[PDB]
């Protein structure tokens, strides 16, 4: 509870001992990396491999395991590049830019429904609907099936987190069955009748199995829901807590780019990723032995004073901003351009249409250690 309120002092104490810290947290032993250069080095180094967040040969949650293990996020060479390249078509700079019209449209529509109310819950009324509508449209999920997709994403995100329980994983296995069955049936529809969406794109193809296509859709659905919502809401809270920076941005909307980058650095939606050592590796005056787990604390690296002067100061004018919130190396976030676009449009439009935006006043974070996610963000305006 105190960690979730302020994880950054916890990160600081680790860094002062060693930027690569041997230890154990929530029963998970390994190397905990708070150092910027160390994080970047590990993420670039292909000898540090990605791995399934459940044991490889585990059949306790057979359907959850099968869904997870087919995702590019947990695949190495040569399967990774194949899977990533096939999905990348929907997330090119040019294709991402083509989403702008729909994003602006949805943002205004969502702000319309609350404009008269003088009050709003940023997540349920704004951040979540936008992110949900956008990613469902990109994937090709009908409007009727969008609420079901929300439920799968919220359940499945838990299954990789340190805070997971036996109950979370059992529920995760059920949602895995449901999501996989749904996307297989949607793929059968798009096979007979291709549409202008990502599912059809994946079917065209060098090529994916129909299960690989389904698991790809599930991954993007989760990423589109969870982390993007966190970015938007974290950014809004961040700006409201620093009224002088908020005023700067309201007066100068062109600062939105540099402002969103500092929100990414300062309150990173993803706080952790992980690697396993495929061999003995020497780095930063320590030896990481084959098989040992490495936990990269991206939020901690983003506060490294050797890279960011006055790291605990929120400064929207920081330039440039080489934060690690989207990761680094071969697995670097596939949808980072989309996430940035959603955030930039949402925040700028919000500040424009709600000129006297204020906090409703004690924030709760969801019980996830790998993510920085608010429970809710009540605001008042007009």
């Amino acid at each position: 509870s105190e960690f979730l309120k302020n994880p950054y002092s916890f990160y600081d104490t680790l860094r002062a001992v060693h930027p690569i810290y041997k230890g154990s947290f929530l029963k998970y032993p390994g190397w905990y990396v708070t150092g910027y250069e160390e994080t970047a080095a590990i993420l670039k180094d292909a000898r540090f491999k990605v791995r399934t967040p459940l044991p490889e040969s585990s059949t306790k949650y057979q359907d959850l395991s099968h869904v997870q293990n087919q995702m590019m996020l947990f695949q190495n060479q040569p399967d990774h590049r194949r899977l990533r390249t096939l999905a990348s078509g929907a997330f090119t700079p040019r294709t991402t830019e083509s989403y702008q019209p729909y994003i602006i449209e949805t943002v205004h529509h969502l702000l319309d429904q609350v404009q008269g109310k003088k009050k709003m819950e940023v997540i349920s009324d704004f951040a979540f609907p936008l992110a949900s509508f956008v990613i469902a449209n990109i994937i090709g999920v009908p409007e009727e099936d969008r609420e079901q997709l929300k439920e799968w994403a919220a359940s499945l995100i838990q299954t990789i987190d340190f805070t997971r329980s036996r109950k979370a994983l059992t529920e995760g296995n059920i949602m895995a069955v449901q999501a996989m069955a749904y996307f297989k049936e949607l793929i059968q529809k798009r096979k007979r009748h291709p549409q202008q969406d990502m599912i059809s794109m994946l079917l065209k193809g060098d090529k994916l199995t129909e299960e690989e296509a389904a698991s790809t859709c599930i991954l993007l659905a989760i990423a589109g829901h969870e982390t993007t919502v966190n970015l938007i809401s974290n950014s809004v809270l961040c700006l409201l807590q620093h009224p002088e920076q908020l005023l700067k941005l309201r007066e100068n909307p062109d600062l939105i780019g540099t402002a969103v980058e500092e929100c990414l650095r300062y309150e990173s939606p993803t706080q952790m990723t992980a690697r396993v050592a495929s061999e003995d590796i020497d780095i930063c005056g320590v030896t990481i032995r084959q098989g040992e787990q490495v936990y990269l604390l991206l939020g901690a690296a983003n506060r490294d004073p050797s890279i960011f002067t006055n790291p605990d100061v929120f400064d929207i004018t920081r330039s440039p901003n080489p934060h690690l919130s989207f990761g680094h190396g071969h697995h670097v976030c596939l949808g980072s351009s989309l996430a940035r676009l959603e955030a930039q449009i949402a925040i700028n439009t919000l500040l424009q249409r709600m000129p006297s935006l204020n906090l409703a006043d004690e924030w709760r974070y969801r019980p996830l250690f790998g993510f920085r996610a608010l429970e809710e963000l009540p605001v008042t305006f007009e």
């Binding site: 154990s24 947290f25 929530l26 029963k27 998970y28 032993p29 459940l54 044991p55 040969s57 585990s58 306790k60 329980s165 036996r166």
Partner: protein, 78 residues
Amino acid sequence: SHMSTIEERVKKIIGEQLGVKQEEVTNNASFVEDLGADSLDTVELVMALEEEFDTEIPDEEAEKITTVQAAIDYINGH
């Protein structure tokens, strides 16, 4: 008949977790080698024991416990 003893409660959990008979769980059995607990099984075992016995085991102490008896001894000692 009788109420569940500490030993019986520990073995019930291990049996349910690892799909073995509650009587195939010997006190001397090692979780990893003998009972075949993987790197999720052992985490889920500690969580289940923590729940059953309403206790919090530090990571350093959990690392020490390799055998059924060691788990029984820890619960008895605490």
